Design an enzyme around this catalytic site. Structure first.
Site, PDB file in Angstrom:
ATOM      1  N   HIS A 270      -1.079   4.184  -8.940  1.00  0.00           N
ATOM      2  CA  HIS A 270      -0.474   5.351  -8.520  1.00  0.00           C
ATOM      3  C   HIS A 270       0.966   5.094  -8.662  1.00  0.00           C
ATOM      4  CE1 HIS A 270      -4.446   6.475  -6.610  1.00  0.00           C
ATOM      5  NE2 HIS A 270      -4.428   5.349  -6.154  1.00  0.00           N
TER       6      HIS A 270
ATOM      7  N   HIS B   8       8.613   0.684  -3.835  1.00  0.00           N
ATOM      8  CA  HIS B   8       8.084   1.570  -5.158  1.00  0.00           C
ATOM      9  C   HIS B   8       8.886   2.628  -5.356  1.00  0.00           C
ATOM     10  CE1 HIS B   8       6.270   3.283  -1.577  1.00  0.00           C
ATOM     11  NE2 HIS B   8       6.370   4.464  -2.405  1.00  0.00           N
TER      12      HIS B   8
ATOM     13  N   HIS C  68       8.829   6.838  -7.248  1.00  0.00           N
ATOM     14  CA  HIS C  68       8.162   7.985  -7.721  1.00  0.00           C
ATOM     15  C   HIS C  68       8.938   8.803  -8.877  1.00  0.00           C
ATOM     16  CE1 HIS C  68       5.428   8.110  -4.164  1.00  0.00           C
ATOM     17  NE2 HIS C  68       6.138   7.459  -3.730  1.00  0.00           N
TER      18      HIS C  68
ATOM     19  N   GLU D  62      10.454  13.222  -4.595  1.00  0.00           N
ATOM     20  CA  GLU D  62       9.524  14.002  -3.587  1.00  0.00           C
ATOM     21  C   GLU D  62      10.241  14.443  -2.673  1.00  0.00           C
ATOM     22  OE1 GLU D  62       6.747  10.349  -2.287  1.00  0.00           O
ATOM     23  OE2 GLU D  62       5.623  11.451  -3.679  1.00  0.00           O
TER      24      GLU D  62
ATOM     25  N   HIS E 244      11.138   4.189  -2.515  1.00  0.00           N
ATOM     26  CA  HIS E 244      10.867   4.049  -1.307  1.00  0.00           C
ATOM     27  C   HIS E 244      10.830   2.554  -0.835  1.00  0.00           C
ATOM     28  CE1 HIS E 244       8.693   8.073  -1.360  1.00  0.00           C
ATOM     29  NE2 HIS E 244      10.114   8.285  -1.250  1.00  0.00           N
TER      30      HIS E 244
ATOM     31  N   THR F  26       3.541   9.913   1.827  1.00  0.00           N
ATOM     32  CA  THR F  26       3.293  10.895   0.916  1.00  0.00           C
ATOM     33  C   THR F  26       2.233  10.861   0.025  1.00  0.00           C
ATOM     34  OG1 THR F  26       4.882   9.689  -0.878  1.00  0.00           O
ATOM     35  CG2 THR F  26       5.842  11.147   0.981  1.00  0.00           C
ATOM     36  N   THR F  27       1.530   9.687   0.107  1.00  0.00           N
ATOM     37  CA  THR F  27       0.186   9.826  -0.608  1.00  0.00           C
ATOM     38  C   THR F  27      -1.047   9.406   0.507  1.00  0.00           C
ATOM     39  OG1 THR F  27       0.014   7.289  -0.769  1.00  0.00           O
ATOM     40  CG2 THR F  27       1.173   8.413  -2.348  1.00  0.00           C
TER      41      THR F  27
HETATM   42  N1  LIG Z   1       5.016   6.761  -0.454  1.00  0.00           N
HETATM   43  S1  LIG Z   1       5.224   6.445   0.879  1.00  0.00           S
HETATM   44  O1  LIG Z   1       5.272   7.418   2.074  1.00  0.00           O
HETATM   45  O2  LIG Z   1       6.373   5.495   0.933  1.00  0.00           O
HETATM   46  C1  LIG Z   1       3.796   5.312   0.922  1.00  0.00           C
HETATM   47  C2  LIG Z   1       4.156   3.969   1.494  1.00  0.00           C
HETATM   48  C3  LIG Z   1       3.014   2.958   1.809  1.00  0.00           C
HETATM   49  C4  LIG Z   1       1.592   3.640   1.524  1.00  0.00           C
HETATM   50  N2  LIG Z   1       0.551   2.696   1.618  1.00  0.00           N
HETATM   51  C5  LIG Z   1       0.200   1.436   1.628  1.00  0.00           C
HETATM   52  N3  LIG Z   1       1.460   0.529   1.632  1.00  0.00           N
HETATM   53  C6  LIG Z   1       1.074  -0.821   1.927  1.00  0.00           C
HETATM   54 CL1  LIG Z   1       2.257  -1.750   2.068  1.00  0.00          CL
HETATM   55  N4  LIG Z   1      -0.103  -1.062   1.894  1.00  0.00           N
HETATM   56  C7  LIG Z   1      -1.144  -0.181   1.831  1.00  0.00           C
HETATM   57  N5  LIG Z   1      -2.585  -0.756   1.913  1.00  0.00           N
HETATM   58  C8  LIG Z   1      -3.702   0.083   1.645  1.00  0.00           C
HETATM   59  C9  LIG Z   1      -3.784   0.115   0.409  1.00  0.00           C
HETATM   60  O3  LIG Z   1      -4.940   0.983  -0.174  1.00  0.00           O
HETATM   61  N6  LIG Z   1      -0.840   0.973   1.598  1.00  0.00           N
HETATM   62  C10 LIG Z   1       1.338   4.928   0.756  1.00  0.00           C
HETATM   63  C11 LIG Z   1       2.511   5.826   0.718  1.00  0.00           C
HETATM   64 ZN   LIG Z   2       6.631   6.317  -1.839  1.00  0.00          ZN
END
Ligand SMILES: NS(=O)(=O)c1ccc(Nc2nc(Cl)nc(NCCO)n2)cc1
Ligand SMILES: [Zn+2]
Length: 257
Positions: free
Chosen positions: A61, A91, A93, A103, A116, A195-196
């Site tokens: 992603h 990370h 986007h 975003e 982010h 946001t995911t």
């Molecule tokens: N784009 S965002 O809102 O910053 C964001 C941040 C974190 C995550 N999800 C995430 N972040 C971390 Cl550190 N660990 C896991 N574990 C679940 C893996 O499937 N998931 C998704 C979107």
């Molecule tokens: Zn993000």
């Protein structure tokens, strides 16, 4: 499975994740004229001097630069936040074209990408517990525009060849995330969500007003990544952004006049 394609993209996510149509979803458009200055907001405190990066991962992603979050080594405090939030990963986007990719938007303007920096509230012990709480996460969002290179980004750009496809990781130690920050820490803040998927409503968003500049060559290298796994048909990892969601009953606050 969810993604960013025509058949599994953001307009489909609500079917598996009904919270997609919730009351505090992210991202949002930041209407700069409607945001209100809140003189009680404290300056942000970004304490990244002891940050310990470990690894970089293509998760299908985006790519995550992961940190040791087993101690208070890189933390975000102050601003709208109560307590201490530990950096776990950052990370980005980004778009297929420089005219889109962020975003959050600012007066409907889309930037080429958005960084982010993800942090969790230490009062909840770990990330998995934190995401179940309304104040569990603090995500520091930073816009990227295309112009001059960002020297502090180049070490990230140059390892991407080694994590081209979904599920690939590479050692990524001694990376200093301070090199990704703009000069000013002026920000907008509002309550929102991941946001995911799973789109959990656990995030205090802190979006910096000042973008960083990255070069065309730097963002082109982001666009060479793949959503697919090795040995699967090549699908470029571009346009991995969710569009702006309804603000509903929320006020965006500004730390600056
Ligand atoms: N784009 S965002 O809102 O910053 C964001 C941040 C974190 C995550 N999800 C995430 N972040 C971390 Cl550190 N660990 C896991 N574990 C679940 C893996 O499937 N998931 C998704 C979107
Ligand atoms: Zn993000």
């Amino acid at each position: 499975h969810w993604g960013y394609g025509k058949h599994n993209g953001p307009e489909h996510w609500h079917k598996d994740f009904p919270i997609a149509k919730g009351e505090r979803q992210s991202p949002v458009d930041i209407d700069t004229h409607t945001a209100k200055y809140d003189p009680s907001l404290k300056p942000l405190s970004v304490s990244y001097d002891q940050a310990t990066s470990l690894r970089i991962l293509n998760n299908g992603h985006a790519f995550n630069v992961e940190f040791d979050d087993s101690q208070d080594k890189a933390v975000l405090k102050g601003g709208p936040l109560d307590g201490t939030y530990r950096l776990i990963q950052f990370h980005f986007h980004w778009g297929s074209l420089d005219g889109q990719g962020s975003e959050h938007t600012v007066d409907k303007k889309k930037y080429a990408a958005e960084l982010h920096l993800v942090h969790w509230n230490t009062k909840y012990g770990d990330f998995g517990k934190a995401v179940q709480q309304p104040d569990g996460l603090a995500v520091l969002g930073i816009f990227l525009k295309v112009g001059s290179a960002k020297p502090g980004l180049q070490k990230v750009v140059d390892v991407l060849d080694s994590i081209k496809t979904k599920g690939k990781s590479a050692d990524f130690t001694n990376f200093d995330p301070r090199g990704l920050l703009p000069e000013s820490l002026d920000y907008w803040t509002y309550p929102g969500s991941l946001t995911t998927p799973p789109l959990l409503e656990c995030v205090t968003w802190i979006v910096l007003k000042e973008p960083i500049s990255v070069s065309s060559e730097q963002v082109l290298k982001f666009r060479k990544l793949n959503f697919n796994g090795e040995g699967e048909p090549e699908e470029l990892m571009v346009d991995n952004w969710r569009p702006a969601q309804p603000l509903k009953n929320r006020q965006i606050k500004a730390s600056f006049k």
